[PDB]
Design an enzyme around this catalytic site. Structure first.
Site, PDB file in Angstrom:
ATOM      1  N   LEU B  10      -2.653  -3.167 -29.641  1.00 18.11           N
ATOM      2  CA  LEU B  10      -3.661  -2.144 -29.293  1.00 18.11           C
ATOM      3  C   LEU B  10      -4.063  -1.262 -30.476  1.00 18.11           C
ATOM      4  O   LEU B  10      -4.966  -0.425 -30.344  1.00 18.11           O
ATOM      5  CB  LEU B  10      -3.151  -1.264 -28.145  1.00 18.11           C
ATOM      6  CG  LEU B  10      -2.998  -1.998 -26.820  1.00 18.11           C
ATOM      7  CD1 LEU B  10      -2.785  -1.010 -25.694  1.00 18.11           C
ATOM      8  CD2 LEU B  10      -4.231  -2.821 -26.507  1.00 18.11           C
ATOM      9  N   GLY B  11      -3.457  -1.515 -31.649  1.00 20.94           N
ATOM     10  CA  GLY B  11      -3.739  -0.724 -32.857  1.00 20.94           C
ATOM     11  C   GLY B  11      -4.980  -1.208 -33.568  1.00 20.94           C
ATOM     12  O   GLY B  11      -5.736  -2.067 -33.051  1.00 20.94           O
ATOM     13  N   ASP B  34       1.718  -4.460 -26.068  1.00 17.44           N
ATOM     14  CA  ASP B  34       1.886  -3.253 -26.847  1.00 17.44           C
ATOM     15  C   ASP B  34       2.752  -2.347 -26.062  1.00 17.44           C
ATOM     16  O   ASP B  34       2.964  -2.581 -24.866  1.00 17.44           O
ATOM     17  CB  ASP B  34       0.547  -2.583 -27.167  1.00 17.44           C
ATOM     18  CG  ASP B  34       0.640  -1.577 -28.317  1.00 17.44           C
ATOM     19  OD1 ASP B  34       1.276  -0.477 -28.115  1.00 17.44           O
ATOM     20  OD2 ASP B  34       0.027  -1.859 -29.377  1.00 17.44           O
ATOM     21  N   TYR B 143       7.893   2.562 -45.793  1.00 17.00           N
ATOM     22  CA  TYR B 143       7.054   1.502 -45.223  1.00 17.00           C
ATOM     23  C   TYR B 143       7.102   0.261 -46.119  1.00 17.00           C
ATOM     24  O   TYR B 143       7.386  -0.857 -45.663  1.00 17.00           O
ATOM     25  CB  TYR B 143       5.631   2.000 -45.058  1.00 17.00           C
ATOM     26  CG  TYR B 143       4.555   0.992 -44.720  1.00 17.00           C
ATOM     27  CD1 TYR B 143       4.584   0.239 -43.560  1.00 17.00           C
ATOM     28  CD2 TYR B 143       3.433   0.882 -45.500  1.00 17.00           C
ATOM     29  CE1 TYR B 143       3.529  -0.593 -43.221  1.00 17.00           C
ATOM     30  CE2 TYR B 143       2.405   0.036 -45.187  1.00 17.00           C
ATOM     31  CZ  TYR B 143       2.445  -0.695 -44.044  1.00 17.00           C
ATOM     32  OH  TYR B 143       1.360  -1.516 -43.743  1.00 17.00           O
ATOM     33  N   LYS B 147       8.648  -3.554 -45.668  1.00 12.88           N
ATOM     34  CA  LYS B 147       7.791  -4.731 -45.769  1.00 12.88           C
ATOM     35  C   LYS B 147       8.272  -5.767 -46.760  1.00 12.88           C
ATOM     36  O   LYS B 147       8.145  -6.971 -46.486  1.00 12.88           O
ATOM     37  CB  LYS B 147       6.340  -4.347 -46.000  1.00 12.88           C
ATOM     38  CG  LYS B 147       5.721  -3.647 -44.809  1.00 12.88           C
ATOM     39  CD  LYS B 147       5.504  -4.630 -43.684  1.00 12.88           C
ATOM     40  CE  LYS B 147       4.596  -4.023 -42.606  1.00 12.88           C
ATOM     41  NZ  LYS B 147       4.356  -5.046 -41.565  1.00 12.88           N
ATOM     42  N   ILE B 173      -7.454  -2.070 -44.693  1.00 13.19           N
ATOM     43  CA  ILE B 173      -8.380  -2.727 -43.767  1.00 13.19           C
ATOM     44  C   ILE B 173      -9.304  -1.708 -43.135  1.00 13.19           C
ATOM     45  O   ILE B 173      -8.838  -0.737 -42.596  1.00 13.19           O
ATOM     46  CB  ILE B 173      -7.652  -3.438 -42.598  1.00 13.19           C
ATOM     47  CG1 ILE B 173      -6.792  -4.601 -43.091  1.00 13.19           C
ATOM     48  CG2 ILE B 173      -8.671  -3.972 -41.542  1.00 13.19           C
ATOM     49  CD1 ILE B 173      -7.499  -5.421 -44.122  1.00 13.19           C
TER      50      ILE B 173
HETATM   51  N1  LIG Z   1      -4.454  -1.280 -40.947  1.00 13.18           N
HETATM   52  C1  LIG Z   1      -4.338  -1.679 -42.221  1.00 13.18           C
HETATM   53  O1  LIG Z   1      -5.174  -1.260 -43.174  1.00 13.18           O
HETATM   54  C2  LIG Z   1      -3.105  -2.488 -42.632  1.00 13.18           C
HETATM   55  C3  LIG Z   1      -2.863  -2.731 -44.007  1.00 13.18           C
HETATM   56  C4  LIG Z   1      -1.721  -3.470 -44.409  1.00 13.18           C
HETATM   57  C5  LIG Z   1      -0.839  -3.946 -43.422  1.00 13.18           C
HETATM   58  N2  LIG Z   1      -1.118  -3.683 -42.029  1.00 13.18           N
HETATM   59  C6  LIG Z   1      -0.185  -4.195 -41.008  1.00 13.18           C
HETATM   60  O2  LIG Z   1      -0.751  -4.775 -39.778  1.00 13.18           O
HETATM   61  C7  LIG Z   1       0.089  -4.434 -38.734  1.00 13.18           C
HETATM   62  C8  LIG Z   1      -0.802  -3.631 -37.800  1.00 13.18           C
HETATM   63  O3  LIG Z   1      -1.275  -2.468 -38.417  1.00 13.18           O
HETATM   64  P1  LIG Z   1      -2.248  -1.474 -37.562  1.00 13.18           P
HETATM   65  O4  LIG Z   1      -3.031  -0.712 -38.600  1.00 13.18           O
HETATM   66  O5  LIG Z   1      -2.978  -2.282 -36.570  1.00 13.18           O
HETATM   67  O6  LIG Z   1      -1.193  -0.321 -37.019  1.00 13.18           O
HETATM   68  P2  LIG Z   1      -1.604   0.661 -35.881  1.00 13.18           P
HETATM   69  O7  LIG Z   1      -0.842   1.902 -36.101  1.00 13.18           O
HETATM   70  O8  LIG Z   1      -3.082   0.731 -35.739  1.00 13.18           O
HETATM   71  O9  LIG Z   1      -0.999  -0.168 -34.594  1.00 13.18           O
HETATM   72  C9  LIG Z   1       0.413  -0.341 -34.374  1.00 13.18           C
HETATM   73  C10 LIG Z   1       0.612  -0.678 -32.952  1.00 13.18           C
HETATM   74  O10 LIG Z   1       2.018  -0.956 -32.778  1.00 13.18           O
HETATM   75  C11 LIG Z   1       2.342  -0.420 -31.506  1.00 13.18           C
HETATM   76  N3  LIG Z   1       3.767  -0.213 -31.511  1.00 13.18           N
HETATM   77  C12 LIG Z   1       4.492   0.748 -32.126  1.00 13.18           C
HETATM   78  N4  LIG Z   1       5.789   0.564 -31.776  1.00 13.18           N
HETATM   79  C13 LIG Z   1       5.876  -0.504 -30.968  1.00 13.18           C
HETATM   80  C14 LIG Z   1       6.888  -1.192 -30.321  1.00 13.18           C
HETATM   81  N5  LIG Z   1       8.160  -0.790 -30.404  1.00 13.18           N
HETATM   82  N6  LIG Z   1       6.571  -2.282 -29.584  1.00 13.18           N
HETATM   83  C15 LIG Z   1       5.332  -2.716 -29.411  1.00 13.18           C
HETATM   84  N7  LIG Z   1       4.351  -2.071 -30.005  1.00 13.18           N
HETATM   85  C16 LIG Z   1       4.588  -0.992 -30.799  1.00 13.18           C
HETATM   86  C17 LIG Z   1       1.598   0.915 -31.454  1.00 13.18           C
HETATM   87  O11 LIG Z   1       1.420   1.296 -30.125  1.00 13.18           O
HETATM   88  C18 LIG Z   1       0.263   0.575 -32.097  1.00 13.18           C
HETATM   89  O12 LIG Z   1      -0.743   0.177 -31.140  1.00 13.18           O
HETATM   90  C19 LIG Z   1       1.257  -3.571 -39.290  1.00 13.18           C
HETATM   91  O13 LIG Z   1       2.420  -4.414 -39.560  1.00 13.18           O
HETATM   92  C20 LIG Z   1       0.680  -3.016 -40.566  1.00 13.18           C
HETATM   93  O14 LIG Z   1       1.709  -2.763 -41.544  1.00 13.18           O
HETATM   94  C21 LIG Z   1      -2.234  -2.946 -41.645  1.00 13.18           C
END
Ligand SMILES: NC(=O)c1ccc[n+]([C@@H]2O[C@H](COP(=O)([O-])OP(=O)(O)OC[C@H]3O[C@@H](n4cnc5c(N)ncnc54)[C@H](O)[C@@H]3O)[C@@H](O)[C@H]2O)c1
Ligand SMILES: NC(=O)c1ccc[n+]([C@@H]2O[C@H](COP(=O)([O-])OP(=O)(O)OC[C@H]3O[C@@H](n4cnc5c(N)ncnc54)[C@H](O)[C@@H]3O)[C@@H](O)[C@H]2O)c1
Ligand code: NA
Ligand code: NA
Lengths: 320, 320
Positions: B10-11, B34, B143, B147, B173
């Site tokens: 949902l993120g 989620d 973080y 990773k 992103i």
């Molecule tokens: N967004 C970016 O620019 C970016 C960049 C590099 C890496 N990433 C990686 O992609 C992945 C997603 O990033 P995002 O930006 O969508 O993060 P986000 O914060 O938008 O979403 C994270 C989601 O994880 C859910 N969550 C948290 N704890 C949880 C749990 N215990 N069980 C199930 N769900 C849980 C939260 O509710 C949230 O919806 C992450 O591993 C992040 O490191 C994202």
């Protein structure tokens, strides 16, 4: 004069480190602990300040730290290279979670904290000859992975909170007093036993697989020395240290020339071989020599001679 | 064809990838989960194929894998760069323990598993110009530390068990649908909202701090593509991928061209600046391009035009 806490103290390194610290700083300055109690023949049986503490018990660990107020900590608990491949759940719980508690307590209680890394933090892209302090880290055992996590997380505590975190990448450690956990370099200790017992050693590391190694007196010297150094002398958190490199065939030659007896050795390639093959043959430890005076007194023959004298005395095996 | 479980769905990334996967494969072949339920305004609200699962609950996670039987998993939950520095216990639990349960389930249930890594896995020794796939990893954020662990652990599952684990180091992103989770590149997304609301942007990143970035559609393409590729096409488990690098000032200018109007940014360092300055300026993603066809269709002005149109529609702000 520091107050020193050692966790995982009944193991290979902790047994001797516990004794060295007590004799250097006095027994009242040194508190040591482990998840189990010493057996009656353990070198730390019958000594005071030897506690039972499971470091996965966050509250207990904090209670002990609160009560004793150490200024130094050596956090030694770990599931090691070979055993960890067999028990990766256990490896991840202990090497990750205890390390995370030990760091938070160091932060919270103002402790200079030592957590050893290992040559197992390296894998096959490290540059196996005279491996440097800073290179590509691609460990191929879960133990190595948890050790890179340890270096990195400890280094994060130093930069984020100013925790005085110090570490060395230990090579294979050889000693007489307590038997090794489940590591790939264990064969080197076992070969001396086999020679004194006159029984065939089945060696799971192939004859020409070189690894960095060190004898305990040197290792103890260096573990005290890096913790004594002024923080301003340290250019980094994690240092390679080595003693000398050897392979099983070389160690065997060393033992045979000291006993003037052949030893029976059958080489197999157990999991230890594939693991050890991923590790450096030799390390560059010049940063450790230069920053804080890492130095090695023993070579392979002096070590074999000491091991051949000490194991009978310490374990009762067939002597002279 | 595949059955796809998305966790952390949902993120920011999960919202759009969930939709793209459903389009591509049928709603019936995709289960998204989620720890929260979608809010009324959420693109995934009131859909079937949307579950509630806390990935720290290992038995619950396994229950759902057992019932749904995925052939593919995208494991997305993580606490990110800036929020991690403030809440490091949370970051350590989620990022390490959920990753561990997810890999363990991928092994037991024979699942092809994607877990993203990130440029935050790099630090100031990486070589910050056209940073390579193999280099020194010294992340300066918890973080990032978690990773590197993720990368190495997934790869160890691959080496040891034959787990099909795949990963990319995502750049920053950019997207409109779901607001970002507390990373160092969130200023970008927020600068679009400031402009449309005609309010002053407080940017915590310094004006000429370049970072690898990518616009979502390109990101969605690559995430599906690396998962489609025959395993024999892959020479590694972890790939850098980028879109194009930009700094806050270049992004200002691109919003300004697109709006044919001045937009007002005030630069006031927050915790994002030191974090971002420790990251690469640009990534070399030639391995990804060559092995499985990573490809980038947007540049900065195409992204800005798309972003300035979608944000009013999707968040109900003022338009054009
Ligand atoms: N967004 C970016 O620019 C970016 C960049 C590099 C890496 N990433 C990686 O992609 C992945 C997603 O990033 P995002 O930006 O969508 O993060 P986000 O914060 O938008 O979403 C994270 C989601 O994880 C859910 N969550 C948290 N704890 C949880 C749990 N215990 N069980 C199930 N769900 C849980 C939260 O509710 C949230 O919806 C992450 O591993 C992040 O490191 C994202
Ligand atoms: N000995 C070597 O060749 C060598 C080489 C490189 C690095 N190291 C490192 O030095 C440290 C000590 O290694 P060692 O050779 O003494 O290991 P060992 O297996 O000989 O002993 C480990 C000790 O930790 C204790 N322990 C395990 N779980 C515990 C827990 N939950 N709480 C408290 N204590 C617990 C064990 O009971 C044991 O006494 C480890 O971090 C290891 O990785 C050792
Ligand atoms: Na050992
Ligand atoms: Na973000």
């Amino acid at each position: 004069m520091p107050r020193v806490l050692v966790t995982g103290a009944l193991g290979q390194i902790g047994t001797d480190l516990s004794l060295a610290l007590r004799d250097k700083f006095g027994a009242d300055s040194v508190l040591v602990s482990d998840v189990v109690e010493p057996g009656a023949k353990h070198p730390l049986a019958g000594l005071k300040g030897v506690e039972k503490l499971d470091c996965l018990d966050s509250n207990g660990f904090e209670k002990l730290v609160k009560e004793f107020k150490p200024t130094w900590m050596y956090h030694l608990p770990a599931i090691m290279s070979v055993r960890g491949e067999a028990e990766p759940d256990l490896a991840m719980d202990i090497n990750v979670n205890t390390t995370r508690y030990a760091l938070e307590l160091a932060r919270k209680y103002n402790i200079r904290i030592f957590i050893p890394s290992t040559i197992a933090a390296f894998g096959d892209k490290c540059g196996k000859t005279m491996t440097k302090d800073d290179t590509i880290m691609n460990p191929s055992t879960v133990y190595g992975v948890t050790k890179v996590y340890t270096e990195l997380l400890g280094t994060w505590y130093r930069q984020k909170y100013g925790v005085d975190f110090r570490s060395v990448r230990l090579p294979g450690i050889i000693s007489a007093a307590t038997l090794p956990g489940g590591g790939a370099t264990d064969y080197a200790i076992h070969m001396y036993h086999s020679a004194l017992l006159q029984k065939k050693c089945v060696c799971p590391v192939l004859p020409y697989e070189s690894l960095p190694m060190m004898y305990m007196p040197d290792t103890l010297n260096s573990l005290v020395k890096i913790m004594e150094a002024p923080l301003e002398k340290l250019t980094r958190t994690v240092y390679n240290i080595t003693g000398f490199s050897f392979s099983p065939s070389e160690l065997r030659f060393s033992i045979e020339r000291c006993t003037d007896r052949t030893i029976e050795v059958e080489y197999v390639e157990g999991p230890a071989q594939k693991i050890a093959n991923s590790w450096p043959d030799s390390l560059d430890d010049s940063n450790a020599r230069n920053d804080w005076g890492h130095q090695v007194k023993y070579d392979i023959d002096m070590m074999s001679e000491d091991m051949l004298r000490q194991i009978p005395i310490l374990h009762g095996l067939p002597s002279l």
